[PDB]
Amino acid sequence: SKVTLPPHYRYGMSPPGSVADKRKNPPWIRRRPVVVEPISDEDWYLFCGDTVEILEGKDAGKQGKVVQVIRQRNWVVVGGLNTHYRYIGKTMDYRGTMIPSEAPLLHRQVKLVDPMDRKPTEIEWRFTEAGERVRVSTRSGRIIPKPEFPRADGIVPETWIDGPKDTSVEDALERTYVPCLKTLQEEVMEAMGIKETRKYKKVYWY
């Protein structure tokens, strides 16, 4: 759950909590770290779910969507575009089923595209005076909303069903606390009918 990562750990697509990650770089090799661009959290404009465009590569000028983002090394993948070829099932007597695998790209090679004309355009962070903070274009002045992407919880609230050990909503938001000058221990003692006649004598503290 909470494992301490090495100070110079290499992020290679696979999450740190996996068998392939422990097989790749086990805690014994301290290879050369890869210095990445020091990008802050407020300037990160591209998210996960919006459409992007590959600048250059084996298939430049093509569109696609992002399914996973990496903030440690600025690695982003495209939904089945700049991909190669490998094999999934591999044994000692038979192997096949060639399934393409995506390749990560950098932020300098990925530009956000506006859905109005489907053209590459640099997007800046212009703080709106209404209250929220969205993304505003530069040469076009257009606004690009945040793409709706499912959270990591793996469950949507539009069809959630309360189980046996799941409470409702009308009881969790019921105002039942009464502010007073009584401790919880004495309150739960006097509420159950527990009484006490003797007191506590004098004691020192040193």
């Binding site: 759950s1 210095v35 401790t183 020192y204 503290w205």
Partner: protein, 113 residues
Amino acid sequence: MPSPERLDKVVDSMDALDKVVQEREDALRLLQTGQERARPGAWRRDIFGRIIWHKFKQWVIPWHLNKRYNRKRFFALPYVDHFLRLEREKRARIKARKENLERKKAKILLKKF
């Protein structure tokens, strides 16, 4: 395990409940007595010359006649100043080397990018 996240969920729920009840107890103590941290104590210097927070153990007999509490010394004595100075110099070297590392990293970032 079928669902290991339920354990962590219950753990964080109980931790939040403990934090809430501790905050309530601290607020009530400040409204009544007005002193933070229900564990009493004072800043005392040990033999090693380290400024630590000594916690009271709550005894029965007082301290002016106890046999085991009187054997617990609380004075620096002029022979630990050199060790404290050496520890300060070591920590200063650590901080200077950390600052040098940060400056080298900044220079590498400005040179490559």
